[PDB]
């Protein structure tokens, strides 16, 4: 009954659910080729939440996905949402590109009393209130104003966000994912000029510290660096997309096969 009320899987862990949780990495890899560490960390967070070992006063997990463009951070968030709910539309997606200005934070928590739109509370608070078991994605956090993330400080530490009306929304059963992109020029400029993965991760992490406050990064459960896609990883991505397309055309009774040379091309 409480699971039906809140949507949180509080029922006893059966053998089917156990084997589904233990194979979460394989399920996420079905949609995300590459990035082993990110999938492992996300799966560990979910398993820790469902084993009852999560700190009750903190959210399930806060992660920062840092990497180049077209690597799969947003796709990983969508795959996690599909694993936890069954559909990607259930994910709560916040586009940080429209938060370029400081006053845009009112859309997250609401407008102060006496100001327009105070009757309707913040969109994020209302969304989390109606769906306490949700995945929240902050996409392209670099494009947002630096001070907008001061709001998330009280959520990553206590799991509570208070709207303007005074109502407190609990984030303690949510997964919070922030995605950061480094352009090709950006990580080209981070390399060492002179005569003669580990160093790349180190320098990207060091550059991340120069853009966010130390107490904001101190509250993140894990900061994961997405590696660049290799040759075989791209081949596997082509294979998976072709397999999906072949299934979708086979349900229409059209049979299609793509040769290896075509996939490589």
């Amino acid at each position: 009954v409480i699971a039906g009320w809140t949507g949180i899987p509080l029922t006893k862990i059966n053998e089917t659910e156990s084997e589904k949780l233990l194979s979460l990495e394989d399920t996420l890899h079905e949609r995300v080729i590459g990035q082993k560490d990110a999938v492992n960390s996300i799966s560990k967070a979910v398993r820790r939440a469902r084993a009852g070992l999560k700190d009750p006063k903190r959210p399930i997990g806060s992660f920062i996905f840092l990497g180049p463009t077209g690597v799969g951070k947003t796709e990983l968030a969508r795959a996690l949402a599909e694993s936890m709910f069954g559909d990607d539309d259930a994910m709560i997606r916040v586009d940080m590109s429209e938060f370029m200005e400081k006053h845009a934070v009112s859309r997250l928590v609401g407008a102060p009393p006496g100001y327009v739109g105070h009757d309707d509370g913040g969109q994020l608070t209302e969304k989390v209130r109606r769906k306490p078991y949700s995945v929240i994605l902050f996409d392209e956090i670099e494009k947002a104003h630096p001070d907008v993330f001061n709001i998330l400080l009280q959520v990553l530490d206590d799991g509570h966000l208070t709207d303007t009306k005074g109502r407190t929304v609990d984030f303690r059963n949510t997964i919070i994912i922030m995605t950061s992109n480094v352009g090709a020029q950006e990580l080209q400029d981070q390399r060492f000029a002179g005569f003669g993965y580990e160093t790349i991760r180190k320098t990207m992490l060091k550059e991340l510290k120069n853009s966010f406050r130390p107490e904001f990064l101190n509250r993140v459960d894990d900061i994961i660096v997405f590696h660049k896609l290799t040759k075989e990883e791209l081949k596997e991505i082509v294979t998976m997309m072709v397999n999906k397309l072949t299934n979708r055309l086979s349900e229409q009774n059209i049979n299609i096969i793509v040769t290896d040379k075509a996939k490589d091309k």
Partner: protein
Amino acid sequence: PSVVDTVAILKGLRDRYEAHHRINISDEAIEAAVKLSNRYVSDRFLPDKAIDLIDEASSKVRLKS
């Protein structure tokens, strides 16, 4: 009321709900109801929501048979 007070309240009200729903309510059910309602239901308040959880679960299990 605190969690222990709510447990005592639910245990006292057990006889009325057993008579209405014609089932047996275990102590473990009382503890689970109060604990789960306290942790996962935040908009409402303890005694009413614990009683609501007990009543809904009892109704469901009664209609099952």
